[PDB]
Amino acid sequence: VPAGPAKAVLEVNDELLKAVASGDWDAYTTMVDPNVTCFEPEAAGVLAKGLAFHKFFFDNRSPNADKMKTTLHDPAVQMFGDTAIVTALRVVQFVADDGPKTTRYEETRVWVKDAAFKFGWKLVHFHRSGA
Amino acid sequence: VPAGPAKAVLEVNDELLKAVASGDWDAYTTMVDPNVTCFEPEAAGVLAKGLAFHKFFFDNRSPNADKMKTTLHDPAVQMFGDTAIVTALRVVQFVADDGPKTTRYEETRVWVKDAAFKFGWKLVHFHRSGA
């Protein structure tokens, strides 16, 4: 059974998390616009732009990124023409110096229709912020 | 001289800040979609929806919200059809128990074209997160 627009973007959004979690850069590029912008903890407080910024973290995965477990919670999509706004809570289990920890992030992901992209959608902007 | 699409949304985005800063609820409603969603510190970690949530803060402005000074820094817009993604850094001067303080927020504002709205644009989602 094929997914409608809203279900479809949710699936691609989930697939992107899988790609990031597994360090699959090639997969990342099938879903993310070359001129993607973002606010995220790793971006040091300013808007980061382009894939090169993100590839840096793929090329230098360290040190216990493999122990990490990430899940998306409470996902929702809102459609505005060819734009889809996906909102969710990202919960990350990781190990720190003090032991196992859990952190929650608010995530906004803005997806745009593009039949040229593998799944018919591309990520153009996202905003992730920690609790 | 009239503003093009990108300049136009930046102006409306600035006007919205002016409305919030001055507690002008009527102005707020000329710019913000009735089904607006948001992530923001005031939303207690989950996605808030609707104008009623925001009106609560207008109706209960307290206690030194008038002393506050807010400015937008490094604004940028990206256009995707009828969607405009405005990104900016929000700097807020306020007084705490310990004295005058300054805080920076990352802000994503998603605006959508609508000729029915006063300025031709409506805010449908935003994401604000503190440093």
Author numbering:
A (entry chain A), B (entry chain A): 344 to 474
Text taken from the publication that reported this structure:
Ca2+/calmodulin-dependent protein kinase II (CaMKII) is a Ser/Thr kinase that is particularly important in neuronal signaling and cardiac function. CaMKII has a unique architecture, in which the catalytic domains are linked flexibly to a hub domain, also called the association domain, which forms a dodecameric or tetradecameric assembly. We reported recently that the activation of CaMKII-α by ATP and Ca2+/CaM triggers the exchange of activated subunits between different holoenzyme assemblies. Our data are consistent with the idea that the CaM-binding element induces the hub to transition from a closed-ring form to a ring-opened lock-washer configuration, which can release or capture dimer units.
Choanoflagellates are the closest living relatives of metazoans. The choanoflagellate S. rosetta has one CaMKII gene. The quaternary assembly of the S. rosetta hub is strikingly different from that of all other hubs in that it forms a right-handed spiral, corresponding to a hexagonal P61 screw axis in the crystal lattice, instead of a closed ring. On looking at a projection down the hexagonal screw axis, the dimers are arrayed in a circle with almost the same diameter as that formed by the dodecameric forms of human CaMKII. An orthogonal view shows that the helical pitch of the assembly is such that the sixth dimer is displaced vertically by the length of a dimer, with respect to the first one. This positions the seventh dimer directly above the first one. At 48 μM, the tetramer and hexamer populations increase further, and a population of octamers now appears. These results are consistent with the open-ended spiral assembly of the S. rosetta hub, which can gain or lose dimer units without steric constraints. Despite the striking dissimilarity in quaternary structure, the interface that holds dimers together in all metazoan CaMKII hubs is very closely preserved in the S. rosetta hub, with helix D from one hub domain packed against the β-sheet of the adjacent domain. The principal structural difference between a subunit in a closed-ring hub and one in the spiral S. rosetta hub is a rotation in the outer edge of the β-sheet with respect to the inner edge of the sheet and the α-helices. The interfacial interactions between the vertical dimers of the hub are between residues on the outer edge of the β-sheet in one subunit, and residues presented by helix D in the other. These interfacial interactions are preserved in the S. rosetta hub, but a change in the curvature of the β-sheet results in a change in the orientation of helix D in each subunit.
